[PDB]
């Protein structure tokens, strides 16, 4: 069967897809490494979730990876759930500025913050939090989520 | 029941166990971050495998993590298979000197073939540096 | 008497004072580390000058320092003149928003010509990113 | 006159030259970034001085510079005097493995540790320490030493 593709993992990917869309819709998604870093540096207290996205090429972009080292360390230090994802383009397609793209749709970092408008408390958030708990409990500290696709 | 516990994952764990043991029954096996980094800087054309190992304790060790980052970026650049292990003590049960990084250098070995396939299968689903659960 | 207090250094300080003032009497002048880093990532063909500023307080700010490192390496790669200033408050007396990095973008200006010569003269003696002492 | 070339600076460069030679001779010089890092990580308590050396090319070697960020931060945090120097080859020529070089003589980091054999207390060390004090007092935190040459 497909590598890494369990029900747990299938569910995590679907939840993330949903969370990215609802977060975007509710205006509580931050897109971009520098935009994300600035929020984490200024006021991190409302970020519920972080996604780091790097393609195979991005693995040898030392600057990008060093930024990842910093964001990830910060997230761990501040108990913010964080997953890695290996398809940058798909991430961009799901969020704002996808579907075609003059100058590549390439976001390497997303923060999802709490909307509290009296808003929707997406259960997708909860499932993903559980997923990351499930990873820690098996000593996978930097968990990845695969395309259910 | 039990996150990440696949047949594939299990065969991966055993294979890394075997591989680690094959080295240590030979020179190989450069141990530690600073040791390994020079090896990569000096002679990376001969290195076949890398294992980064860290516990939850080490997530706020920015020095160690920056090095994990530089090691990982290099291996990926230079097509060395590389893997994360999360249980530093269980790794220590297989080998001494503690031990956050292991290089395997100048191979057929069912274990090495198998792990090599494991890593390509991870790449298939965009997991460029996958985690391995050691057995016991 | 007074370390680093050369005629050349003095003319450098005044020229940076003037340059900073010329911008702020214009768009230019991207302020701050995260701001500047995107600018460099996005459109570095238009950036003419960088100033990293930090105090003794900031030497153990590894986040800030890693960014100083990435900014500096980029500028050198891409031939943007870049300079270190050691008095963050005295820098603040010239410009608001506090402020560890300043980009100047899309120039003749005696100050900019002069600083451009200053930086080449630093390179002459292998000082790739020199310090400037602001006057007052 | 030559940029940066004051008596203070002329003296600093000569002192450093001397310190590199005496340290080498007394077997209390550590050569290399990884060798240096390991000493600083294991037991830093006997290192008196650090030299970081990078040529113009080295300025765009992100890995090297990140190592520099770490060594330098550590040195500042632990009050070890540290200077930067911009001629790697000359540094190598002065220390071991210079004068010709099969596979370039390229050391990017030197630590000088206390010899105490009942040994020579090089005054060059003292002058350089003073030099670095003189730099701090003028808000030049990462001081450089130029070739008197």
UniProtKB/Swiss-Prot annotation, chains A, D:
Changing residue 70 to E: 30-fold reduction in homodimerization affinity and 90% decrease in growth inhibition activity and ability to stop cell cycle. Residues 33-76 are annotated as: Homodimerization. Pfam families: Ribosomal_L7Ae (PF01248). Keywords: Apoptosis, Developmental protein, Differentiation. One of its GO terms (biological process) is positive regulation of apoptotic process. The keyword Nucleotide-binding does not apply. The keyword Protein transport does not apply. InterPro entries: GADD45 (IPR024824), Ribosomal_eL30-like_sf (IPR029064), Ribosomal_eL8/eL30/eS12/Gad45 (IPR004038). GO terms for cellular component: cytoplasm; nucleus. Gene3D superfamilies: 3.30.1330.30. Two central helices mediate homodimerization through parallel packing. Belongs to the GADD45 family. This is Growth arrest and DNA damage-inducible protein GADD45 gamma. It comes from Homo sapiens. The lineage of its organism: Eukaryota, Metazoa, Chordata, Craniata, Vertebrata. The gene is GADD45G.
């Amino acid at each position: 069967t497909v590598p890494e593709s369990t029900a747990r993992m299938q569910g995590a990917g679907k939840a993330l897809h949903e969370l990215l869309l609802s977060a975007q819709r509710q205006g509580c998604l931050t897109a971009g490494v520098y935009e994300s870093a600035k929020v984490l540096n200024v006021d991190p207290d409302n970020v519920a979730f972080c996604v780091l996205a790097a393609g195979e090429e991005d693995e040898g972009d030392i600057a990008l990876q060093i930024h990842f080292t910093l964001i990830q360390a910060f997230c761990c230090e501040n108990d913010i759930d964080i997953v890695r994802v290996g398809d940058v383009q798909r991430l961009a397609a799901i969020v704002g500025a996808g579907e075609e793209a003059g100058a590549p749709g390439d976001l390497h970092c997303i923060l999802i913050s709490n909307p509290n408008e009296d808003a929707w408390k997406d259960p997708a958030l909860e499932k993903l939090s559980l997923f990351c708990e499930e990873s820690r409990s098996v000593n996978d500290w930097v968990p990845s989520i695969t395309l259910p696709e």
